Design a protein around this ligand. Structure first.
Ligand SMILES: O=c1ccn([C@@H]2O[C@H](COP(=O)(O)OP(=O)(O)O)[C@@H](O)[C@H]2O)c(=O)[nH]1
Ligand SMILES: O=c1ccn([C@@H]2O[C@H](COP(=O)(O)OP(=O)(O)O)[C@@H](O)[C@H]2O)c(=O)[nH]1
Ligand SMILES: Nc1ncnc2c1ncn2[C@@H]1C[C@@H](O)[C@H](CO)O1
Ligand SMILES: Nc1ncnc2c1ncn2[C@@H]1C[C@@H](O)[C@H](CO)O1
Lengths: 223, 219
């Protein structure tokens, strides 16, 4: 019996950092890192190609990217149900919900996907998933768009130095509608009541992470 | 129990005609017809695919092949049931997406990604969408183009002849010479039936339907 937890947060808030932190702390704790972040500096080929494209001309490629990136996530968390794990916990790096209600939905609103692409994507999504990876909990790593902005700066990936404060602000608002106010409605009945834990990570924690983690073990003890 | 046979063939060779014909002759005989034939968003995407195919080919193929996949999964649930599909997931790939890639309307990345996906879309869900046999409706491309005009269609009245030829050779290679190799290995074995439908058969299909039965009798 493996519990599944999704760790969520904006570009550069500290997800793979944190995710690599609890990694080391438990033999019963495994993580699945988001394939998009690894393409991000032969699936690596396809993955590498589509990301630069996506940046250069989102209005052309958001639909091919979002489907490929989401397919990539389903097969990764699947191959992890196997892999490992007495008191198992699987941490996901972001989820198939993130894909759709944060990134895909955002590109429609931005018009980089038209009604047709969005409507198709929505039922591919709806369908692709009805056919196991339901989550037991959600951890929300909360940071302001300016913290993420400088942390994209401490990361120094080429492509992301472009990314402007306004796109981060945009994504922040959607994480807050979804994970705090629980304002957003989904087409997945259960994700209206998945328990959620919200961690504030504006303060660095790379070597001052004990409370965060005590908070994690608590919430985990209450599932 | 429920055998699945594919009716294959170039555009307007007569596939929609033969399966409807076959459909009235036996309580054991049902069919699942390809959605592109049928073509809301499928209709916008189809229309866009005629407009700027270098833009919409990847998107159309996706939707077209999963729109097919579910349709056939929906049908899959008499004494000797036989379900004929109006083409298969293989047609989608090794006839159409192929060609479109070959014609540069998909780039390498697009192509590789689609093959990957397909590879996975039709394995995860291979539970009986797998074919028992294939019936190749064989027509000359010059025949298929009269039937293009016969069927009288908006967008269709301009199919260059040359395209139909693009589609012929691919069929012949897969279906006649059997030169074409895949990643659906079973496929390079499965019995194929080659039918000549150059002669109109709308009201003369007994010889056609005789063979289909001699054929089904050996599976
Ligand atoms: O407490 C922290 C958390 C994160 N980071 C840095 O912020 C950048 C982006 O964080 P990460 O890649 O983990 O964010 P993700 O987007 O994966 O959430 C990296 O340079 C991390 O070193 C940091 O310096 N202090
Ligand atoms: O023996 C035949 C078979 C077909 N057709 C006509 O050819 C057109 C296209 O055939 P169909 O839609 O069946 O071809 P498909 O694309 O479905 O292979 C239709 O208007 C048919 O009525 C015909 O006149 N004689
Ligand atoms: N679905 C997605 N998952 C993870 N990251 C995504 C997704 N869609 C877009 N991105 C990011 C945002 C940006 O860094 C780049 C393309 O804009 O990829
Ligand atoms: N996958 C496909 N299945 C059936 N027809 C297709 C497919 N891809 C393209 N077509 C045809 C070719 C042309 O007649 C029209 C527009 O591309 O649809």
């Amino acid at each position: 019996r493996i519990k599944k937890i999704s760790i969520e947060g904006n570009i550069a808030a500290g997800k793979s950092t944190f995710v690599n932190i609890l990694k080391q702390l438990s033999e019963d704790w495994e993580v699945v890192p988001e394939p998009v972040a690894r393409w991000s500096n032969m699936s690596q080929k396809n993955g590498g190609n589509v990301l630069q494209m996506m940046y250069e001309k989102p209005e052309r490629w958001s639909f091919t990217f979002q489907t490929y990136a989401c397919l990539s996530r389903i097969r990764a968390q699947l191959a992890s149900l196997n892999g490992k794990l007495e008191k198992p916990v699987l941490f996901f790096e972001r989820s198939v919900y993130s894909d759709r209600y944060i990134f895909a939905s955002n590109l429609y609103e931005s018009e980089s996907m038209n009604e047709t692409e969005w409507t198709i994507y929505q039922d591919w999504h709806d369908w692709m998933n009805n056919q196991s990876l339901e989550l037991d909990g959600i951890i929300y790593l909360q940071a302001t768009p300016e913290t993420c902005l400088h942390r994209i700066y401490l990361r120094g990936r080429n492509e992301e130095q472009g990314i402007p404060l306004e796109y981060l602000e945009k994504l922040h608002y959607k994480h807050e509608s979804w994970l705090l106010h629980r304002t957003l409605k989904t087409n997945f009945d259960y994700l209206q009541e998945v328990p959620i834990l919200t961690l504030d990570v504006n303060e660095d924690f790379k070597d001052k992470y004990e409370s965060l983690v005590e908070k994690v073990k608590e919430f985990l003890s209450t599932l």
